[PDB]
Structure formats: structure tokens, C-alpha cells
Ligand binder design. Structure first.
Ligand SMILES: O=C(O)C[C@@H](Cc1ccccc1)[C@H](O)SCc1ccccc1
Ligand code: NI
Ligand code: NI
Ligand code: NI
Length: 160
């Protein structure tokens, strides 16, 4: 079922989310399936549960069309594997119509759980890594405008 995505300005995007504790449940399977459908209708590559006003450590991401594997990730934890940063374009479904250039870690490891309870641990780079970092920020109440360094790159998609 498609859910409403809340927009920047909503206090619900500024929370730090608690852990998922119903791995393998029907309830969690239903929420994940709704998040994939939601992400798909909005033409996203990532979506975090706080963006649909669900206060949990849970994100979906991915796309066929470099491809990033379709993933649902609960209780994520991330770590940089070097200090190397890379600039790239980002937008956000809770900030419709805008983009900016944002520095992120080029290389990371992330760990958490698939909805069925299986552990997930992967090394990621480039675009894969960026998506994960961007969604992770939602879980700790951060949006990308707080990370812009060059405000000349912040603007409307149709205009830039
Ligand atoms: O709003 C979110 O939290 C989901 C974003 C994820 C994103 C993260 C990093 C870089 C780009 C996007 C939305 O998917 S934005 C739509 C989009 C689609 C393809 C390429 C770029 C942006
Ligand atoms: Ni469509
Ligand atoms: Ni976002
Ligand atoms: Ni490589």
C-alpha cells in the first residue's frame, strides 16, 4: 500500500529512530512491502521509514536502472573504510524539486538485518555508498541541506 511521504519541516524527520524488534514478523513484512511500493510510486532510489512517519531504524533502497541491489535493511550501522570523500548530486523525496552537491564517504561498510532476520554485512562504494549514507541520516534526524558546503549547487532540478 502506498503511504504518504512527509516533507521537510515535519518534526517527525528530525527524531532519532528506535530499533526494529519484530524481525521475521508479518507486521514488518507488510511495512517493508509498503515501503518498496511507496519508493516505486515516488521514483526514488532509497526511502527511510521516518519519511513515511514510521519511527524505526529501517530503510529500503536499490534499483536495476551502476546498479545498487534492492535491499531492505533494519538496525543499520555504518562505518567509513577511508577518509576519502566524494562530491555528488542528491535529492530527497521529502524535499521535492530540489538538489545539491553533497560530500559523502566514498567507501563504507554497512551492517544490519533483512526483514526475515538474516544478518547483512556489505562493503559499498560510490553511488551505492551514498544512498546508504543518505538514508542512514534520516534515522538520526538529519537532512542533506545541513551538509551542503557549496551553496551555489543548491537549486531546483529543472533549472540546474
Ligand atoms: O529521500 C530519500 O531519503 C531518498 C532519495 C535518495 C537519494 C540518495 C542519494 C542520492 C540520490 C538520491 C530519493 O531517491 S531522490 C530521487 C533520485 C533518483 C535518482 C537519482 C537521484 C535522485
Ligand atoms: Ni511512475
Ligand atoms: Ni531523503
Ligand atoms: Ni571498487
Amino acid at each position: 500500500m502506498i503511504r504518504d511521504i512527509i516533507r521537510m519541516g515535519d518534526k517527525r524527520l528530525l527524531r532519532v529512530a528506535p530499533q526494529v524488534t519484530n524481525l521475521g514478523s508479518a507486521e514488518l513484512h507488510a511495512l517493508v512491502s509498503d515501503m518498496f511500493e511507496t519508493m516505486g510510486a515516488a521514483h526514488g532510489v532509497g526511502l527511510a521509514a521516518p519519511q513515511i512517519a514510521v519511527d524505526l531504524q529501517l530503510m529500503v533502497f536499490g534499483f536495476e536502472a551502476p546498479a545498487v541491489p534492492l535491499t531492505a535493511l533494519a538496525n543499520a550501522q555504518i562505518e567509513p573504510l577511508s577518509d576519502e570523500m566524494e562530491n555528488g548530486w542528491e535529492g530527497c523525496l521529502s524535499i521535492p524539486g530540489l538538489r545539491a552537491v553533497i560530500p559523502r564517504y566514498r567507501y563504507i561498510r554497512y551492517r544490519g538485518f533483512a526483514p526475515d532476520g538474516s544478518p547483512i554485512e556489505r562493503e559499498a562504494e560510490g553511488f551505492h555508498a551514498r544512498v546508504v549514507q543518505h538514508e542512514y541520516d534520516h534515522l538520526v534526524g538529519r537532512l542533506y541541506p545541513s551538509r551542503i558546503e557549496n551553496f551555489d549547487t543548491f537549486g531546483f532540478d529543472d533549472v540546474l
